[PDB]
Amino acid sequence: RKLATIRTAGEITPIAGAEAIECCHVDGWTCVIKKGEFKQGDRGVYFEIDSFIKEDNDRYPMLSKQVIDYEGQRGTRLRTARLRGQLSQGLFLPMDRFPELASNQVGDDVTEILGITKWEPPISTNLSGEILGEFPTFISKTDQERVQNLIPQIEENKGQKFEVTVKLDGSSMTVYRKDDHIGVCGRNWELRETATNAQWHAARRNKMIEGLQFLNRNLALQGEIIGESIQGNLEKLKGQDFYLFDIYDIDKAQYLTPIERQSLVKQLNDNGFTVKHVPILDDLELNHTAEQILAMADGPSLNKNVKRAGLVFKRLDGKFSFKAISNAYLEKHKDR
Numbered sequence: 001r002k003l004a005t006i007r008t009a010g011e012i013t014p015i016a017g018a019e020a021i022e023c024c025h026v027d028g029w030t031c032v033i034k035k036g037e038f039k040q041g042d043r044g045v046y047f048e049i050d051s052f053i054k055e056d057n058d059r060y061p062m063l064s065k066q067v068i069d070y071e072g073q074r075g076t077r078l079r080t081a082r083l084r085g086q087l088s089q090g091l092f093l094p095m096d097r098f099p100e101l102a103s104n105q106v107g108d109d110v111t112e113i114l115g116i117t118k119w120e121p122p123i124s125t126n127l128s129g130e131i132l133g134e135f136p137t138f139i140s141k142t143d144q145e146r147v148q149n150l151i152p153q154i155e156e157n158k159g160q161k162f163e164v165t166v167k168l169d170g171s172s173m174t175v176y177r178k179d180d181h182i183g184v185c186g187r188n189w190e191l192r193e194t195a196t197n198a199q200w201h202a203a204r205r206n207k208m209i210e211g212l213q214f215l216n217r218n219l220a221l222q223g224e225i226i227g228e229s230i231q232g233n234l235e236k237l238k239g240q241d242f243y244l245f246d247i248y249d250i251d252k253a254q255y256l257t258p259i260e261r262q263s264l265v266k267q268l269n270d271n272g273f274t275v276k277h278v279p280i281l282d283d284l285e286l287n288h289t290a291e292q293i294l295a296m297a298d299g300p301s302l303n304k305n306v307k308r309a310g311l312v313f314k315r316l317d318g319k320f321s322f323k324a325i326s327n328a329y330l331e332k333h334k335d336r
């Protein structure tokens with residue numbers, strides 16, 4: 001959760017026909033600034049899209065007309081915008097607006113000291129349930145870092161191969177076995193089985209609980225539940241369903257590699273537990289800029305008549321992964 005970090009102004013490029021602003025590159029992001037607010041190499045606090053910034057017209061007067069009520073507080077949600085034809089994401093403010101950060105270094109996470117919180121879309125009806133417990137501390141959650149935030153790592157991984165999957169727009173769902181317990185989790189909690197709980201229903205329907213009893217291993221099956229009344233049902237499914245994208249090895253505290261995961265999926269298939277998988281595209285040998293990766297994000301989703309939310313890249317050893325969200329998708333879906 002690094003919503004607000006100290007970053008470096010990259011290339012600064014004019015915005016044709018708008019002399020009072022210019023375009024500022026910050027890592028893989030592009031962001032509109034007041035002309036002369038920065039020059040290349042200056043440091044500033046960068047606030048990512050999905051940041052929620054509490055109302056304050058002394059420090060954030062550029063946000064005044066966009067204040068909303070959210071989770072009981074007045075503040076502004078930073079979102080993708082289109083300025084003079086120019087794609088703008090985030091807020092970039094010079095260090096001298098933050099006297100309390102005078103001692104800080106480039107790259108520092110200042111999210112807590114600045115009080116920034118995360119905006120998120122409302123959760124869907126039957127995906128909140130009765131909670132049975134914490135999300136298990138022995139299972140990794142499924143968050144992915146954005147390619148825009150991975151400029152050095154993208155170049156450090158030149159030559160490496162990644163599994164490329166379609167990023168489905170649903171909700172994260174984890175089904176797991178640890179010794180004598182099998183549980184079903186949403187994104188942040190473990191859930192009780194009820195007749196009305198969507199996650200449990202998808203787990204029973206595809207027999208993945210039976211499949212985990214078959215495999216007899218401490219594994220977390222991690223995937224996206226999508227379909228009707230889930231986040232606008234982009235794929236236009238009937239009903240709801242689970243699509244696997246990861247298997248976490250609980251005992252070894254690590255994810256299965258894509259080839260390990262594909263074998264384990266094939267064996268579940270071959271034994272009558274057909275777990276579906278997020279769409280898998282051609283493996284990609286990485287030799288790209290973040291801009292080029294982002295240019296691949298748009299395209300066909302699971303439903304090939306709809307434009308997907310983006311891509312997720314998983315290195316073949318399973319130990320480096322990131323997401324490339326489609327900016328066309330973010331312009332089309334203002335609730336994202």
Ligand SMILES: *P(=O)(O)OC[C@H]1O[C@@H](n2cnc3c(N)ncnc32)[C@H](O)[C@@H]1O
Nearest residue numbers: 142143144165166167168172245278312
């Ligand atoms: P998104 O920006 O919501 O952040 C990552 C989450 O995306 C979901 N997800 C959908 N499809 C995939 C694939 N193919 N791989 C990994 N994750 C995926 C998960 O719920 C993530 O937590």
Ligand SMILES: [Mn+2]
Nearest residue numbers: 168169170171
């Ligand atoms: Mn999502």
